[PDB]
């Protein structure tokens, strides 16, 4: 489903990735024309989506993406 709180969304997304590192994938969609941001994490079984129109979410998404990359690269 969809979430309203970024903290809960990230908490669920990290557990979803840890459940299956290979099946999990993350997609980020940016719409400058409409001024919207969307983040989706799915493994074709359970999907978590979050939509935002606030400038404060950019840094949080960057931190989440960096941590995801580091966790993926780490064994």
């Amino acid at each position: 489903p969809q979430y309203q709180t970024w903290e809960e969304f990230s908490r669920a997304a990290e557990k979803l990735y840890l459940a299956d590192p290979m099946k999990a994938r993350v997609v980020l969609k940016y719409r400058h024309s409409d001024g919207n941001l969307c983040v989706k994490v799915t493994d074709d079984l359970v999907c978590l989506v979050y939509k935002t129109d606030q400038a404060q979410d950019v840094k949080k998404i960057e931190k989440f993406h960096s941590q995801l990359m580091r966790l993926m690269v780490a064994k």
Binding site: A24, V27, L28, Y30, H32, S33, G35, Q54, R70
Partner: protein
Amino acid sequence: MVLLESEQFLTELTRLFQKCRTSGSVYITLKKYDGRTKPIEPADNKCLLRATDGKKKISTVVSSKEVNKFQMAYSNLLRANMDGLKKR
């Protein structure tokens, strides 16, 4: 697809963000990269990032030796090119 290194990947992602300003969306996908090149050796220290806008697509692979350098640059690029929202 067009597989490029980090230096060119960031520059092309900047062009994608600029070109998707008035009309168009930016798709960025991150996924753990095993390293396969043939249909089903498997590496566990690679990640794959694909950036597309519907017409042109680019892909990049980041490993342990370059994660430290790529993370900060990618975050700075996102901060610079993902503006245009409400500041409350």
